[PDB]
Design a protein around this ligand. Structure first.
Ligand SMILES: [Cl-]
Ligand SMILES: [Cl-]
Ligand SMILES: [Cl-]
Ligand SMILES: [Cl-]
Ligand SMILES: [Cl-]
Ligand SMILES: [Cl-]
Ligand SMILES: [Mg+2]
Ligand SMILES: [Mg+2]
Ligand SMILES: [Mg+2]
Ligand SMILES: [Mg+2]
Ligand SMILES: [Mg+2]
Ligand SMILES: [Mg+2]
Ligand SMILES: [Zn+2]
Ligand SMILES: [Zn+2]
Ligand SMILES: [Zn+2]
Ligand SMILES: [Zn+2]
Ligand SMILES: [Zn+2]
Ligand SMILES: [Zn+2]
Ligand SMILES: [Zn+2]
Ligand SMILES: [Zn+2]
Ligand SMILES: [Zn+2]
Ligand SMILES: [Zn+2]
Ligand SMILES: [Zn+2]
Ligand SMILES: [Zn+2]
Lengths: 219, 219, 219, 219, 219, 219
């Protein structure tokens, strides 16, 4: 399926790309485009360079706000699969040091610059966004991004879609800490009523609660 | 979020109030307003006195059928949090003896009058409603209320919303008997195709079946 | 509830019949009508002879393409409950040899003719449909049917509806192999984006993935 | 394997009989012989009439205290499989009314006399033993027997052996209440340090705790 | 820990070797030496060539019945880790064709000769032993070996030790079929009261039953 | 039951005290006495002051090596229930700062001195013992103690007894991290073949492995 753009709020757009992975077939991955004054910033690549180049072109030609910089929410190919495209298209890329290290271990290109959030609960302000490291969950390095004007929380792959009980790709997950990481994000951003998972539809805070439940160690 | 009213059938309305509870945020609670000839009856308060007073005012001014009496489906603050408002507004309140006893233990005000349904499976007719005690489930005292004109079954908190697998607040639950209590209610009221949970959207009998499954002891 | 017809694609219709089964009440069962040149073929009966006769009549009078033959996807009464009606109405019925044997053991009438797909993974072409035996799942004999013009995969009862975690009627299930059988079907028919379960709404490939997850042996 | 006798305390003996049940093979069942002044009483038959007759003969010839009466701890064939032998050998048999009713439903002979313990928690003194009905567990009618001189608690099949996590034959079990029934027995007889399960070795109170854990509804 | 020999029955000995595997440390692996007229046969190597050579030497010097041939119960290094030693010491090695193929895939040396048991339930007589392929379990190729004079069933790694609930190394397991494979072995060899797991102490049929329970798909 | 002493190795003794806790009854708690030149050190109190005073007296009168100092492995009453006795008897008590803080929160007396091991994996040498903080498990502050002459690892309550699947008192447990904490201890002390849990019998490394399994987040 081709690459789709949907408006989530004032100056906040979701990009969605698809990849066919047998046996189940097409799987979506979502990220964001965030408008700033006369440029935009990007949260996550799509699956590959071609899809990522389509996102850059859309921001330049449709929003008229070319992508200047990007952040990447963990070291997997749905979030960093299009790094060569971003680099060739002049986008200045950012990730945590741990994400960059895991990217190299996993055969992905690291970002060009470092987000200094290494402790659990650490937050910074980057291009009008709040970036939090809530601890390991879907991947040890996963970060979340909050946009405080529209109160949109981008949970990425740490937040599971809808009412699923499937945990998704758990190859790199911290099964012990994931539910606490979700609680940490939910407590850090109480005003965000719109929550974006990477692999499903935009939703509300019910997907925070559901994710924390389905990934929580039980008695 | 403010207090909402939705029509479910002839003379049957749902009231919904919200409370912000970290980490997950707003949580709805639902109850009913049931029209009678020139007055109405209430199933459950909302979370607090202010929301409950808004329900009384709506019945008086919008339906023109002031609330005369109420029933309360178990001793938690989403169902009995607005008792002082009901009492001050002249509403005559009813609950089972067990609910009244648990209300006192839990720091809530008991109802002024007793519903005589203490045995499992016992039912009475109260203001045109059938009230059943199906046994302990979400709380040991939980009762259910059936409105037989429109065939609406109010399951309250004993029925979980939608397709969730979360059990909600289980602090006071009877985990051994809950699925049997749901079966008891479903068998008692086969004609009710509309089922109302306290913490989600109106639905059909699929939420009876799903609740019984997700709360059933497994092998 | 009465018997319903819904168009799924060019020349492909879903039939749905209901049965009241306490405690939960009405349960739907779905099958298909597949148009051919001047006749049609049927996938599955409804619950009983009366509902099945209504399907035959609809194909004759509304589609003007009378049902000539049928296939049955496993030996339970939602799929073979209307065999006497089909036989009396001149429909030539087909099932696997294992389905016919299990039908007799279960008190159902067997089909008049045999589908030769006894090995796991075996497929045949029957009236423009691909019929696959993917191995035991909901029932040891369950088969799936793919319509390759519209790319519709009829999973029958081997595919669970929506986002449920309930396994349905497991009296005859192969709990060890069911998730592999679902994977086998999904790998055999990658182009089918429309998936039909017997007991829920038409959906996409997400119900293949969800079924395989909820029925998969866990660690 | 043949029928075995082991001394558990002053005047208290365990009888053990075996039955070959494929696939796993021999399975033991245990009961007790309790000496009184110049006669004895029996707790449970063995699997069949021949084994039960061997127990009667042993009490008469070895203890010199012929069995006068018996109690039966629930309606399954390991506990009531030898009723014809007891009746022919002049033993006066006792069970609860519920056990007698379930015996008839299950194709076993009922006892000749009734133990009046129908409410949960009800206890009586019978031939120097305390008999408690703790509620449904392995079977809805299961009772337990405490011998207060030696402080031996006969849990029968309601108590699982050793450190197993298997629940045994659950065809007739009350999965919701079983762990509470075990707690009820443990609270009723705090001084009993010797605990006898039907299907394993004599042990201590650790098998009460383990049984309650492995059969307890979990979150 | 060094290599140990223990007599299990007339002409049947267990060999046990140890390997230190962090974090848990020493892990035993067991196999058998089976005496024949003036030679012996071997079931499984130990972990490595040195331990396996010690087994060959013990049979030659202590039993005075040199090992002529061997069978290997699946393709893992505890069972086939000492193949070079056996081959150099003149032992003629046998395994199923599937075991030989999986050995090559897993970096182990295959056996020199083939055991023709490829269908589930197939059995052959080899050097007075019955060898059964019961279907996939701990590994897809696992076979079991029964010695009918002493009625000793060697379950190898398909049978878990004692009362554990741990499944051991499941990297290559068939989680769907394992409990059925255990049932198949138990039904094939009802007279064997001594059961040998690879990674624990000799035991009785209770470890067949426990293994089947702990590895069985649950509802 | 009264207070028991058992020799575990040269200069290393286990002390065991009992407390009756309904419904299950007596529960043991274990700690150690470690001989040094002409004095000893203590690992953990018993349940109360009287039992703890008996341990001090035994070291003075039987070993002739009076207890000079003690360490406490977490803030629960089985480990710190006898602090007043130790303090009155002149024993100099040590615990981590986190244990002292949790002791105060839980109504126990803190130790007089601090063990400086606050980071996960931190170790110190104290009176010839290695003390490790492996991360939260049974309690967030739990530490383990290794005696390297006899290679005895005292796991305290972080290690569950025998082959149980019960988690014990989990009121204060870190369910996400406990299995990793056990792995951390097992990796830190590979030479210790004797492992002491607080609530069961001395055992080997199998109880490390079993604990890590039964408390590990599963898929
Ligand atoms: Cl979604
Ligand atoms: Cl809902
Ligand atoms: Cl659906
Ligand atoms: Cl036992
Ligand atoms: Cl063992
Ligand atoms: Cl123990
Ligand atoms: Mg540049
Ligand atoms: Mg008044
Ligand atoms: Mg004809
Ligand atoms: Mg008589
Ligand atoms: Mg040769
Ligand atoms: Mg001093
Ligand atoms: Zn990822
Ligand atoms: Zn992802
Ligand atoms: Zn409630
Ligand atoms: Zn509620
Ligand atoms: Zn079916
Ligand atoms: Zn069906
Ligand atoms: Zn029984
Ligand atoms: Zn029994
Ligand atoms: Zn293996
Ligand atoms: Zn092995
Ligand atoms: Zn503790
Ligand atoms: Zn403890």
């Amino acid at each position: 399926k081709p690459v789709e753009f949907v408006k989530l709020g004032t100056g906040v757009w979701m990009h969605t790309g698809y990849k066919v992975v047998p046996p189940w077939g097409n799987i979506r991955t979502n990220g964001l485009i965030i408008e700033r004054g006369d440029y935009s910033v990007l949260v996550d690549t799509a699956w590959n360079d071609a899809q990522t180049a389509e996102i850059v072109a859309w921001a330049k030609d449709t929003l008229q706000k070319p992508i200047r910089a990007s952040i990447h929410t963990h070291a997997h190919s749905d979030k960093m699969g299009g790094m060569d495209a971003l680099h060739m298209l002049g986008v200045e890329t950012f990730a945590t040091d741990l994400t960059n290290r895991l990217a190299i271990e996993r055969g992905l290109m690291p970002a060009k610059n470092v987000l200094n959030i290494s402790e659990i609960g650490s937050q910074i302000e980057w291009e009008g966004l709040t970036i939090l490291y809530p601890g390991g969950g879907h991947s040890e390095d996963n970060i979340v991004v909050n946009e405080g004007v529209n109160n949109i929380l981008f949970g990425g792959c740490m937040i599971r879609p809808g009412m699923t009980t499937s945990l998704g790709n758990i190859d790199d997950a911290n099964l012990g800490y994931w539910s606490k990481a979700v609680e940490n994000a939910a407590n850090a951003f109480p005003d965000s009523q719109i929550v974006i998972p990477s692999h499903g539809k935009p939703a509300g805070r019910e997907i925070l609660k559901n994710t924390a439940y389905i990934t929580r160690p039980k008695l």
